[PDB]
# Entry
Amino acid sequence: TPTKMATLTTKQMWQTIKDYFGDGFVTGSAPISYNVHTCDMQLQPDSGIHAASDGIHYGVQISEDSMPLFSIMGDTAAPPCTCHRVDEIVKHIDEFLERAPEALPDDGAITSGKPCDTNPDQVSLYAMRDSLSWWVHWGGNLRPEHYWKQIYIGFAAIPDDVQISPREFLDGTYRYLGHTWDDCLSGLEEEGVSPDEIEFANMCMWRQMLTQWLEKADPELLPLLKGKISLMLQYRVLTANTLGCLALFMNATADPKGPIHYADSSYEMEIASVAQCVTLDMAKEAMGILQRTEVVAGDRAQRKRELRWIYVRCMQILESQPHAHMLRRYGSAGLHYVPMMDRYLERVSGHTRFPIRDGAARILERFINRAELPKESEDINPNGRS
Amino acid sequence: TPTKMATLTTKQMWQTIKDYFGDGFVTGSAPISYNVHTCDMQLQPDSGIHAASDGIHYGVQISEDSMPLFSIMGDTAAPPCTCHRVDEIVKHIDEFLERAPALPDDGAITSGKPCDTNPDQVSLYAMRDSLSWWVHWGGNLRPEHYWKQIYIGFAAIPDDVQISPREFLDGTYRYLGHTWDDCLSGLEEEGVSPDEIEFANMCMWRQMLTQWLEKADPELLPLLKGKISLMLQYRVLTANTLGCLALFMNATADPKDGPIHYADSSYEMEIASVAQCVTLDMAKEAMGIAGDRAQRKRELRWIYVRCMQILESQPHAHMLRRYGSAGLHYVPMMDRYLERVSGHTRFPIRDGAARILERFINRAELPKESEDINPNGR
Ligand SMILES: [Mg+2]
Ligand SMILES: [Zn+2]
Ligand SMILES: [Zn+2]
# Structure
């Protein structure tokens, strides 16, 4: 076997995740399609009669018919289905990756939109704060046995704020708070995550890094998805990687009496990952007010009715799924983590950064591999090693 | 029976609830009757071992150690205990009622939103809030719980409209056209057992009395201000989270548990009613609306995590965990609180919400100036 070790091109990485995920419910949709078609979800009437063990008792339960009571909400309406056009998106990405150079001038730049972000390791530190905050609102704790699962969350958070070349992520050039990606994979192995589960979360991260980079590097991609709400939602869940994060969270939280097999649990996991992404839009509306009142109508209002339509049906499906005791809370967690997390309060307060207070810095310290930090980042989290 | 005790004074109302509730964990404390004592609670380390049926999976779970991650939160601190002198609070109120008067500001609106001029319009916003709370607790809008939701409205309105206890009991005060007796009769028709109804009724009596005493007796609040742990107990009674909880559990429980009896479940119910009050204050201060505000915030988080941990192992955790922590998601979503931060105004009631609220109005018993409230709900 001639040892060939040239770093995969972005096109070859795209092809790798195609071969792994395969098509979703539309042919030619690999790798950017889920197996579940949310446009086909139905809402069952609630008889109000529930056993003590019913899944409706988990998470946050907001009936569809009650949503007009809340001014930031309203009623629901079925979205139009543009999902069959996903093959045209994949074809376009195939074209773009054939000609794309192996590196870009803007690779590694800050894209958080906040003018005070100038050091990528500082941005990574704020992402670790955010990552642990999500973990806790999902239901997890800060016990040390889940260290590398929480590092994974940080890897999932940072490509939103930093343009990360998928090749530098792959080959070890990019480091999150001093950790290479392979350091994270090796850590998950140490934490006992099964090889099959690691590869699933690994491929989900490959797909996130690729789709995050594509929307920054290919100016045509987002305008292609815009307005096609069913396709845009699918793409947003991929760039958020709520599915990969969920896989490792279930591993950390599961009753010790088996492994998380996508084959068996793909449906509940995809449904729960879609629900949490929709809660972001539902909850962000209150933020500006919590600091800005406006009448929203027309197509803007229609998009919100469609997102609420998807959310309530996702949540009802989770009631009867085997892991409702974990997934209902994951699905609705944004209804309480958005109003509490610095990440979102910072945006409303003039796009500044909240200082990392002493208590938070001490929590974050152990997630930093200082030995592998650049010289210019030697001084990050100064109040943390106290 | 000869019709005796046809009318009740405010003093006899106090004696009635005193005889009904009995003492709490201190002698002579009736009707301040909670047996749970927040000051003595202990937080246990999380083992991390939780079965799928574990109660930690219900509600919102925010570990104490994680709270410094959120700038609007922080660390915790134990509160000082003054609870063992609730008996002197009761003796103080007994003394006041020997000479209690009718207040001059009866009927006035106290909503904090200057645009409120019609008490029945204020009641309609309170009904909006009441269904919003009910939904975030986990409830639905099915018609068989109508009068339980009216009960929530009665519990919400005395903060926004000054209501005398006597006018409340004799039907002079009407909530959206309903007398209090209408609600009691309605709960009977809904199948709530007579013992459950009387419990909810006595909790409402206690709420109306405790909230009235705060305004009528100028010495009561200064007396409580120096006794924070007792002021918390008192605020829980003026919020009537326990009476609302009893009726919510009745609507939400599996019909294989029989009636939800407070004699049976008083411990978990008291814990949950305290959790909800603490969460509400903890969330209102944090997200933007007490000798040391900063210190009290640390004590509220201290109480919150200990109450929630106790709820993990309670028989009705599948209802009470969410009840205890619901404020973490209803405070940022409900018009009631968004209206306050947004210049203390009122958000219009859109046609969709008006149609929900329409059936809750007894239009036949409204005054003339209020005949046409909720116009877009028909
Ligand atoms: Mg750019
Ligand atoms: Zn579709
Ligand atoms: Zn005490």
